[PDB]
Each structure stands twice: as C-alpha cells, then as structure tokens.
Design a protein around this nucleic acid. Structure first.
Ligand SMILES: [Mg+2]
Ligand SMILES: [Mg+2]
Lengths: 156, 1202
RNA sequence: AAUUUCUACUAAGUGUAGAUGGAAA
C-alpha cells in the first residue's frame, strides 16, 4: 500500500505523458481529457464523502460547458436534474416502499427517533446514493471508452 | 497598489490538518473496560477475509450458472468472422453480434436464480451463512455499508461495457478470438496426427468425451466457457499429470516435435484465459525470493528460453524484428555501431537528402521539425539497421553475441550468488544491519532488471505489417515471465527502505457506522462528537450511544468552572438543500408554496437555458426568503440579511449569498465539575487535541497548521475560513518497544552534528529517547478545513497576471536554476537587467529570535554521498539521499515565498521537457519535479506565519498566485506567478555581449580542418597586447542560423582548464605550438602558412586548442575554488568578463559564477517574455507566445546591452 | 537526538526552524 500506490500512479502518469501526441487532431483536447480524467479520479476515489452533509466537496452542465468549448463530442449523461440523490435530508422526506419491509418486522412507525429504524433507513439511502453515483461514473467511463476506441488513445 | 494586492481570495481549497489526541482522566481505562478497541481491530482485519468469502461465493455462482448456457449466435459469429474478410459493414454486424452475445450471457446472469440479492444488504446476512465463519460474516451485523466499495466493482464484473475485469468481454472477445484462432490453426497440425500419441492417451485419461477435433470444431465453446472447460483445454495443450509419473504429453510438445527436421514454421495452440509478496518478515521474504529466483524458478527458465531463442535467432527473418524507437535506441546504437549518435546521423542524412534543398545550411525551425519527424516513427526494422550498417557488420551475429554476453553475465552473477539459494542457508543478522546478503540480492535483481531493460525494445508496439509472429509468439511468452521481476523489485526495495517503525492505522468507529460526519447542533446526538475549549487546552468529546444526550441538559454554570462549548451551525450545500426541503411533503403541508410557485419550480425556469426569467424567478426568490424566515431552525441560529429581490440577477447569486452567510460558530458555556464527573461515569469520552505547540513550554513560533487551527475559533474568522466536516479519527500500535530505543542518557554532554554551531557540544537534564512517538500508541486525529469557501475576486489567473504585468512599469523577476557547484542559485533582476541580489541556497538561514544560525545542505549531501560510495551504493543510502533532497526542497520554499513577497515578482523556472540535464547536477529530474509539486502546492496558498493574521499576507488573507497542479505535462509555459522557460543556451554564454560558441571543433580530419581553418577571417597576433586575436563571420559555418552580430573578435588571455586535471594557459600554448612549427607569426592573416602542413598531430593539437579558446566554463571538479566563467570576447570598453574579477564585490552588476549565470539568463528570457507582454492588445494576451526561440533569445541578449 | 507527519537540527531545556491534504485501491 505504498509500492503499488506509486506503481499504479507512475504507469498512468507515463500514459498521460505519452498520449499528448497520438491525437494529432485539431487541437489540445488532451488538456480537457486529462482534466476530466483527474476529475474522475477524485470522484471515484471518494464518492462516499459526497453522501455526507458538509464534506469538503463541490455538475453535468458544467462539464458539458467546459467540453463544448474545446470541441469534443459531449457525454450523453444519464440525468441532469441531480436533485434527488439523498445525502443528509434525514429530516426532510417520506414515500419509500420498504416501509412494507420494516413493518414486516417490528421496527417502529415513520418516526425516526427510534434508534433501530434510523440505521434501517440510513442503509437504504446510503446504498441508493452510491448506486446513483456509479451510474454517473459509468457515463464518464463510457465517454472515455468511446473517445478511446475512436481515436486510439488510452484512458480508463 | 503593488502586484500582490489583487491576488487574494481567488478560489477555494481544502487542506486538512492532523493533530494528535490524548485521552484525559479515566477515559483510556474506560475504553479498555467497555472494550471498544477489539471491535474495530477486527473491523479492520477481518475485511479481507470476508472479501475472500464473498469472492468464493461469487466464483461458485459463475461456475454454477455457466453449466446452463449454450450460446446460439456463436456459429453465426465464428463462421462469419473466419469467412475470409471482405466486410462492407459486415464487421459492423459482427460487432453487433458480439455485443448481443455479451447481452445474452448478461441476460443469463440477470435471470440467474435471483441475482437482485447479490449486492444488497442481505448478502452479509442470509445466503453466505449456508463452520466458525458464521461469526466472521456475522461480525458486521449492524454495519453493512463498508461493503459498498466492493458491491460496485463486483457488479461491474457482470456488465457488458467491454470493460477489462468483466466476465463478458473476456469470454466473448478474448477467449473466443483465441478459440477460433486455434480452430483455424488446427488445420496446420493435421499432418502430424499419430493416434498412439494424440488419441490413445489424452481422450482416455482426460474426458472420455468426443475426440480432440471437437475442441477445435466450434460447438464445445459452451463447454469450455467454464473454468473446468478451460482446465481441460489447457490440459490438452500442456499435458496433465493425473497424479502419476507419466507426465503425459500435450499438443505443444507434439507441435514441438515437428522441428526435428529443423523447420517448425507452425504456430502452437495458445493457452486459454481462465475465469478468476513479502513485506512482513525476513524469513518469509527470503523464502519468497528463493521461490522466485532459484535455479528452477519460472523467471530463470524464461531467461533460458530467451537465451536459446536468441541463439537460434538467425532462422527468423530480419524484416519483422522491430526495435523500439525512443530512449533505448541510443544504447542500441552504442552497441551496434560504436557511438551514441550514429543511427540518428544516418536517419538525418536519409531525411535531408529528400527534404533538404540543394543547399546544406539549416534553420532551427527545420531542425525542430526534423526532430519531430524523427520522433514521428514508431520503430525500426533490423533490416534497416543492416541498411545503415556498412561492410563486416552482421546484426544477426552482433546482437546475438551481445545478448549471450548479457546472459553469461547473469550466469556469472549466479556464480556470485550461488550461496543464497541453498537449503541450509542462515541469516546471521537482520537485513537492516546486514550488508553482504542484501547487496547480493541487489546485484541479482538489478542484473536481471537490466537484462529486461535491454530486451525490452523488441516489441515495436505491434499493430504493424507482417512482423515475425513465429518469433514474437514465444518472445512475449517469455517476456511476460521476465516482467514478473518487478513484483520482486518493488517488494524487496520497499521492504528494506521502510522505517523500523510502522504507520498502520484503522478508522475508529465507536460502535456506530454513522460517525462524526458533521458538527451540527441539532444533529450532534446523531453524529456523536463535539469540541470543547478551555483556556487553550482544546478537547474532543465522544458521547456513548447508550447515553447520547449528555450535553443537552447542562446549565450555564456560575461557580466559574466551565468548558466553553461549540455550536457549529452550518447550512450544508444551499443550492441543492433548499429545493430538497421546501418541496418535500411536509413543508408543502406546513408552508403552502404558491400554485404558480410549485409550477415554476416543477417546470424549473429558475435555471439558465433561456427559460430564465427575472421577474418570474424573483417570486421564487421571495418564496425562499419568506420560507427561510418561517423556518424555526434557520430563523434563529443564523443571521441572514440578504439583499432585495431586484438585487439578484441570478438564483446562483442568491445561492452564493446564502452560502456566504450560512455558517456561524459561537460558544455557549457549560460546567466543569459536572462534565468531569460525567466522564468519570463513562457516558462521555474526552480527548485533548494536542501537538508540540499546545504545550506550555513553546517559546517560539507554532506549526503553520496549529496557527490555522487556533484561527478556527477566532472572532477574526471573517475571512470565510470554515471548519468543515468529514472528520475522522485513528489509532496506531506500538511499532517499537520502549527498551530497545537507543536512548541518550541524562546529564551527559551529548554530541552535535551541525558543524556551524558555536555550542559545539551540549547537555540536557533529562532523557531524549530515539523515536519516542512510536513507543506507546497515539490517537491520530484529522479535522479537515476548507480555506476560502466563498471566493470573491474570481478571474482567470493566467490572464490576470499578464494584464497586470503589461500595465506594470518596473516588474521584478526571480530566476531559479540548478547547478553543479551549488544546489540552486537565485538571481533577482529588475525590469531593466540589473542584478539586484544573487546568492546561493546551499546555506540555510534559520531566522529565529535574534540568532541567525545558518546550516549547510551541500556539505550534508556530499558527506552522505561518501557513505553511498563506501557502502556499495545500496538502497538505504539511495532513499536516505532522496529524502534529504525532499527536506531541502521543502526548506527552499520559505526563501522563495519570502523573496516573492519582498520583491513583488514573478518566478522563472527551468522548463524540463526542452531540457538536457548534465547528470552531475545534484538535484536531478525526479527531485526537481517534486520541487515543482511542493512549490505550486505552497503557492496555492502563500502565507508567512510571523505576520499578523488579519492583515493581508496573513493566515486569513493568504496569497493565491497559482492554480492547482493538474498533470505532469499541463505544468508547462505558464502557471500564475511561476513561468516555465526552456533552458537552452543559458549556462555557456558571455553575459556582457552574448557571444556563444556554436562551432563543432572536435577534430575529424585535415580534410575538414584545412577548410575550417581557411574559413576564419584573420588569424593574427597583436604584439602590444600579446594576444592571438582571431576573427570570423558566422554565416560561413554550418548550424549557425541563430546569432545576430556575427562579427566576433576573439582573443586569448585568461587561462582555461583542460581535462586530459589539466591546467594550462592559452597564449603561451599558442606561442609554443607556433614555435614548435617555426613561424614568423607577427604579420597577420597567417592562414596562408597554416594551410601548408600535412602531419596529423599538428592539427590534432590545434583543434584541441581552438576548443580551449572556446571553452567558457571551467570546472576543476575536485574543489569549489576555481569554477570560473571567462568569455574570450570583449565588449565596447575593451575588457572581457572574468568571473573571479566579479566575485570579490558586495553586489555585482553581473553574475558571480557559473550557476548564477545560469539563473541570470533564465531571468533574461522571462524579461523578453515581459517585453512581448508589453507589445500586444489585451485581446491576444491569452495567446501571446512564451516559447522564446534560440534565434530570438540570442538576438535579445545581444541587443540588450548595445 | 524529543516532532499530527516529513527534513535538518539540540536552537537557551520535555523542545527549535521551515513543511505537510487526509481516507481509498
Ligand atoms: Mg515552533
Ligand atoms: Mg529525524
């Protein structure tokens, strides 16, 4: 967890150094692609702290804005509206289907003061958040694979 | 208003601190009684084991359902591919069929007995139980979410995106394209079919199925899809043992028998892909190293296959053995021809005979295009190297004997190391203190590694023409095995270079998966963590989940024992929290959103996209305003004071307004005796945030991080600094024990090691143990902050520095250059060219209380490199030196930062990818790139600690004058206040006028030397100054399209240094050579006499004196005394520059010596870039080129002085 | 040779001067 840490980063670093000549298309689109790739490598690094309310973090329309300016094809995302990824509105919702599950066991009703049902909704919203963000992440990997096997570069 | 009053509060950041945490009172024994360490020690260790169990079940799932799939479109893919090309979008139907086939196995998995409960919560619960592993998988009964970093990737194993690790891409586009390749190559084994060998044994002991032609006919691909089928297939290729000593033959051996008639020329059947290192102890690492490099190891057999391959190499054609272009081709030139630069010369001539005109002189742009066209090519053929070669040079012998020399060299180091792979081997000393054993291992590993690096270039990146596939097929089949040595090199190296101590830690969870995410009051009974101040000994509070409300019912105590207590109200993410709450079924049933308001949010016209309407979104703005006023938590706990409704041209502006304001930490008090009685009850846990500055002895300046953290609770916290969340906590273990630390005793005169201390020896009253911090354990704490969360002066920094520098009228410039005599060398230049301050950075001043004690780093470097010399250059010495350089390029940054503040400048910096290092410089390329990183890191947020925090340049209002680092190429040609500049013609240049030599005067022949000596204008001799004045134009010489003056009246005086250590003079050497050859050389234009002689040694000892007239740099290379730069051309005042003439002043007007000159020229190149910054419009400032060429640079450096 | 950590220290005596953005493969 130090040797492989340096190895996997210097391999990829050599590829980012090496692929600045392969494109040989209209422009310096390598800058936008490496900027996107490192953005991917932050996102997929700690997706989990996006679930926290106030973690050190801060989408799709901004990426498409910075991508149209250089002239690539866009990304064809899965959603643009983004406002339903649940993070710490644990005081600010109710409609979920698994109340049928939670009433199949004892649990309690829809009042989260019970210390047992709290984690039993926290688990589901955590998994729904991660399942939303990887559906996001697969769209970026699909964009990089399409732009990889169209122009013969290397990004993953 | 100078050039740093703009650059503050420009963009966000996120540092994170790291303080220690000591528990107070009975908290530690309370933790040990309630047993809150064993749980998370298990919750760290058992995770890889439960990963092993879930990988067991997953592979059982694959091998389960793969026995239930028979692919139907397989024949329609196989025959339509092996149908003999000719597509016209039939390969597109092939790819459609391929993705549909992956979809078919994807659909098999989707319906494969549920599969919806394969990555949800119940997988740790229900299926995986049905030994003693029931508690192992049951250890996470209330804690599931840590598997979500696994349930995503093992889901992506079952995709169809043609990803690498996935099942579908493997089993359709690698296994099938190997299978049908073997199906076609089955046509070239039918001529050797002996049933006594291929059928009488294999079919009887492997399957008892249909015979060997069924595996090549394509309708048991559905049988070979499982890993059992891949096992049977690789059994028919390689040969099973069936636990008996037969060693039953295989198809590889049956095709290997065919070259008994010394002609194989038939490719074998490639084995099929199946479907799914040390670092602890000395005996283990020695055994695994024995396992991987003994005399029957797989890597060693790969070397044996490779040496026999290059023994019988001549049978392959020389038309396909492609040698890789790039770095290694220089050493291949050195071993195929004789010099580092001959392949490039032949390719040069081959290119210029086509693209060069019928002249011969070049331009520098044509040279750069020539170098680009040489780097355009991918690889070279061995046949083209025979084409380059003249007579008596057969590469098929030369490379063969080179590689057999290397293999015999590996055999000789085996003859050195043969005492190591023996069964009765002993370890007399651990590898930290032993030398002979570890250096033996080093020589072995580096020798095999060098062998790999030599073999490496025989790939040619494939995707070429008809390359020798019969050669590459076993070449890669040995090279995959030779590449495994890096798994041993990056095991042994990072085993030996690790510290004796160890920094392993596990996240502390305290019985809860939801732990310290935030610090919000009215969520603190959920997050269960708070922070208390008292005087200055800060505190961290942990409340147990059985008693999770032990801070709510506390009175404002009045018996004067108090802990102040945070409140920390933070509205998190207000652009997407406000619509999350104000349309969520309970606010919609408390505060009715207008009928048009609900519709205006549901259609969503507040966003951009031209549906954006001001007086339509202003009602939404008023609705947000009034509803936040009506909300009970956010009407009180903040002080929201917005603008008016017409004062928001964007809801992004309103979001920025509420994000700006919505953060406030105050302090409502509490008791002391009831809090400490409570932690005595054990319902609280209390840790003190601590480092080596919260002690009550710290009589100096703190650590930059403790200055921030003390500034997190100031009333000056107006500069938008914000303590964020995402905090963690950690726990270490005692790597060392207490006894075996080498401990300096008390009351003894203890030594020193810095030699420039006047107190040459000191003594203390107590002990100072070596590495006390790892004797016990310690609680590391992290507490991540977010500097400048709301930015105000937002602009493109790369343009704002330029539009600043143009309007500026005397812009200072720093330069920084590496060197050989010094590590770095700083030179500060005004807007004209006057050197303001030039000094070395080998000595480090530590300007504490009043006492400027310096310390050298250059002496430290050489004193450690002598240990490197005397200790056979092993890994510990290497990494010790690399860390010493890392500490040095840490401590440079304070000098560079303070210099930038003191002179209001822009740093120049040596660009690297245009560079030709010199090897000897002490700071090499890797350490210099780390210096780049640890300079742009720090100039992201420049702050000096001694300043006042409120004032600009302080810990609240720091300078941001860079961007963040992106990627190792994207650091080029501008970064804020750091400029990158190519380092061409910066060390060997006369600083007074700008004469540089460009004359290739390495002697070749009298045939060249006669024309070269006639090309000069007037070789004469002045008797009234005793100088051998030469004269020339430059235009009559090759490689000379860059200078501007081209009227260079050379001279001679000032002795120079030859190598041969060879100290000479110059004009006496010229006179003694010309009196050796008997000349009346006092009647100028003596070229007519010089073009008469015919012995070689005269011209050979003249070229070696022309070169010494031209050699400007002089290194005695054994002492630092005479490193003198002298220039054999004089300026208008008739005096030519000498370095020692300019060393002995206080502040010179020219560079002192060679490294300082190397800095001063870089500063001059940035000054030229500023001069072109002054000569454009503001609409091209983002496009004004900075890559100053050699021609432009020599022109500027000559016409600056006049 | 004391260190949240790293480098050089012993720097007025349990530390000094610069640095350090953490978890994750
Ligand atoms: Mg200090
Ligand atoms: Mg140390």
């Amino acid at each position: 967890s130090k040797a492989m840490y340096e190895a996997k980063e210097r391999y990829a670093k050599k590829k980012m150094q090496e692929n600045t000549k392969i494109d040989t298309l209209t422009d310096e689109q390598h800058d936008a692609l490496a900027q996107l790739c490192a953005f991917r490598h932050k996102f997929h690094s700690n997706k989990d702290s996006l679930f926290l309310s106030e973690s050190a973090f801060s989408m799709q329309s901004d990426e498409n804005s910075k991508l149209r300016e250089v002239g690539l094809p866009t990304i064809e995302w899965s959603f643009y509206d983004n406002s339903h990824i649940p993070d710490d509105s644990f005081r600010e919702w109710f409609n979920f289907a698994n109340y049928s599950e939670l009433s199949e066991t004892i649990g309690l009703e829809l009042d989260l003061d019970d210390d047992e049902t709290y984690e039993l909704v926290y688990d589901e919203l955590y998994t729904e958040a991660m399942g939303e963000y990887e559906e996001l992440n697969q769209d970026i990997e699909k964009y990089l694979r399409r732009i990889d096997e169209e122009h013969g570069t290397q990004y993953c | 208003m100078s050039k740093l009053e703009k650059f503050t509060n420009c963009y966000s950041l996120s540092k994170t601190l790291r303080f220690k945490a000591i528990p107070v009172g009975k908290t530690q024994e309370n933790i040990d009684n309630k047993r809150l360490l064993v749980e998370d020690e298990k919750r760290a260790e058992d995770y890889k084991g439960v990963k092993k169990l879930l990988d067991r079940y997953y592979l059982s799932f694959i091998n389960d359902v793969l026995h239930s799939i028979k692919l139907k479109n397989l024949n329609n893919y196989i025959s339509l591919f092996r149908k003999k090309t000719r597509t016209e979008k039939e390969n597109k139907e092939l790819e459609n069929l391929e993705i549909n086939l992956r979809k078919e196995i994807a659909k098999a998995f989707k319906g494969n007995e549920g599969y919806k409960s394969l990555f949800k919560k119940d997988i740790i619960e229900t299926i995986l139980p049905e030994k003693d592993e029931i508690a192992l998988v049951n250890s996470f009964n209330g804690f599931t979410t840590a598997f979500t970093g696994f349930f995503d990737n093992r889901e992506n194993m079952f995709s169809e995106e043609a990803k690498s690790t996935s099942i579908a891409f493997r089993c359709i586009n690698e296994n099938l394209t190997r299978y049908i390749s073997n199906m076609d190559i089955f046509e070239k084994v039918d001529a050797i079919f002996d049933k006594h060998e291929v059928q009488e044994i294999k079919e009887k002991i492997l399957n008892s199925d249909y015979d060997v032609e069924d595996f090549f006919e394509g309708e048991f691909f559905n049988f070979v899809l499982t890993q059992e089928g891949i096992d049977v297939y690789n059994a028919i290729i390689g040969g099973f043992v069936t636990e008996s000593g037969e060693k039953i033959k295989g198809l590889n051996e049956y095709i290997n028998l065919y070259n008994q008639k010394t002609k194989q020329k038939l490719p074998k059947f490639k084995p099929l892909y199946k479907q799914v290192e040390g670092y602890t102890s000395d005996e283990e690492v020695l055994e695994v190293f024995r396992n991987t490099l003994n005399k029957n190891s797989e890597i060693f057999s790969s070397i044996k296959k490779l040496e026999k391959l290059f023994k019988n190499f001549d049978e392959y054609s020389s038309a396909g053995i492609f040698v890789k272009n790039g770095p290694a081709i220089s050493t291949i030139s050195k071993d195929i021809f004789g010099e580092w630069n001959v392949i490039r010369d032949k390719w040069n001539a081959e290119y210029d005979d086509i693209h060069l005109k019928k002249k011969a002189v070049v331009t520098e742009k044509y040279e750069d295009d020539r170098r680009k066209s040489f780097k355009k090519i991918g690889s070279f053929s061995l046949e083209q190297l025979q084409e380059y070669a003249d007579a008596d040079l057969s590469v098929v012998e030369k490379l063969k004997e080179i590689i057999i020399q290397k293999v015999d060299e590996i055999y000789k180091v085996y003859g050195s190391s043969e005492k190591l792979f023996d069964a009765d081997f002993v370890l007399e000393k651990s590898l930290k203190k032993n030398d002979a054993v570890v250096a033996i291992m080093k020589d072995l590993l580096d020798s095999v590694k060098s062998f790999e690096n030599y073999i490496k270039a025989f790939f040619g990146e494939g995707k070429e023409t008809n390359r020798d596939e019969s050669f590459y097929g076993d070449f890669v089949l040995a090279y995959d095995i030779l590449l495994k040595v890096d798994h041993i090199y990056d095991a042994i190296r990072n085993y030996v270079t690790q510290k004796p101590y160890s920094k392993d830690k596990f996240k502390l969870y305290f019985q809860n998966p939801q732990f310290m995410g935030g610090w919000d009051k009215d969520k603190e009974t959920d997050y269960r963590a708070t922070i208390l101040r008292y005087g200055s000994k800060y505190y961290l509070a942990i409340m147990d989940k059985k008693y999770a409300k032990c801070l709510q019912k506390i009175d404002k105590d009045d018996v004067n024992g108090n802990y102040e207590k945070i409140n920390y109200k933070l509205l998190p993410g207000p652009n997407k929290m406000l619509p999350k709450v104000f349309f969520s079924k309970k606010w919609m049933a408390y505060y009715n959103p207008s009928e048009d308001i609900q519709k205006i949010y549901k259609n969503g016209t507040f966003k951009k996209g031209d549906m954006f309407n001001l007086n339509d979104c202003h009602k939404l703005i008023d609705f947000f305003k009034d509803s936040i006023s009506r909300y009970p938590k956010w009407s009180n706990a903040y002080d929201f004071n917005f603008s008016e409704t017409e004062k928001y041209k964007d809801i992004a502006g309103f979001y920025r307004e509420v994000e700006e304001q919505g953060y406030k930490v105050s302090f409502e008090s509490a008791s002391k005796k009831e809090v400490d009685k409570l932690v005595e009850e054990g319902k609280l846990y209390m840790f003190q945030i601590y480092n080596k500055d919260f002690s009550d002895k710290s009589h100096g300046t703190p650590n930059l991080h403790t200055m921030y953290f003390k500034l997190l609770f100031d009333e000056n916290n107006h500069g938008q600094i914000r303590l964020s969340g995402g905090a963690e906590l950690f726990m270490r273990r005692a790597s060392l024990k207490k006894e075996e630390l080498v401990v300096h005793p008390a009351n003894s005169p203890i030594a020193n090691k810095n030699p420039d201390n006047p107190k040459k020896t000191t003594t203390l009253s107590y002990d100072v143990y070596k590495d006390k911090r790892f004797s016990e354990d310690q609680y590391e704490l992290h507490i991540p902050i977010a500097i400048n969360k709301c930015p105000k002066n937002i602009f493109k920094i790369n343009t704002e520095v330029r539009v600043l520098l143009k309007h500026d009228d005397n812009p200072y410039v720093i330069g920084i250059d590496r060197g050989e005599r010094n590590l770095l060398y700083i030179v500060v230049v005004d807007g004209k060219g006057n050197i303001v301050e030039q000094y070395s950075l080998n000595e480090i001043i530590n300007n504490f209380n009043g006492i400027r004690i310096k310390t050298d780093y250059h002496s430290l470097l050489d004193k450690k490199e002598k240990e490197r010399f005397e200790a056979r250059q092993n890994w510990t010495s290497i990494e010790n030196i690399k860390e010493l350089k890392a500490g040095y390029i840490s401590q440079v940054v304070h000098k560079i930062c303070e210099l930038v503040e003191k002179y209001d400048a822009v740093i120049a910096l040596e660009d690297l990818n245009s560079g030709f290092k010199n090897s000897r410089v002490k700071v090499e390329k890797q350490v210099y790139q780390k210096f780049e990183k640890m300079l742009i890191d720090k100039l992201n947020y420049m702050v000096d600690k001694k300043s006042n925090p409120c004032a600009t340049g302080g810990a609240l209002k720091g300078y941001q004058i860079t961007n963040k680092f992106e990627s190792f190429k994207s650091m080029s040609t501008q970064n804020g206040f750091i400029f990158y500049i190519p380092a061409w013609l910066t060390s060997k240049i006369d600083p007074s006028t700008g004469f540089v030599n460009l004359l290739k005067t390495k002697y070749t022949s009298i045939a060249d030397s006669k024309k070269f000596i006639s090309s000069f204008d007037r070789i004469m001799y002045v008797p009234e100054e005793d100088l051998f004045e030469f004269a020339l134009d430059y235009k009559n010489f090759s490689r000379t399209d860059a200078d501007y003056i081209k009227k260079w009246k050379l001279y001679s005086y000032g002795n120079r240094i030859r190598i041969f250590w060879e100290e000479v003079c110059l004009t006496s050497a010229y006179k003694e050579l010309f009196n050796k050859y008997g000349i009346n050389y006092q009647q100028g234009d003596i070229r007519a006499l010089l073009c008469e002689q015919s012995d070689k040694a005269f011209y050979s000892s003249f070229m070696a004196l022309m070169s010494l007239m031209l050699q400007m740099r002089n290194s005695i290379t054994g002492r630092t005394d005479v490193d003198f730069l002298i220039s054999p051309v004089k300026n208008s005042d008739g005096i030519f520059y000498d370095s020692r003439n300019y060393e002995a002043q206080e502040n010179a007007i020219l560079p002192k010596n060679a490294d300082a000159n190397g800095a001063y020229n870089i500063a001059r190149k940035v000054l030229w870039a500023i001069g072109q910054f002054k000569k454009a419009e503001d609409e091209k400032l983002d496009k004004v080129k900075i890559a100053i060429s050699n021609k432009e640079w020599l022109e500027y450096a000559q016409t600056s002085v006049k």
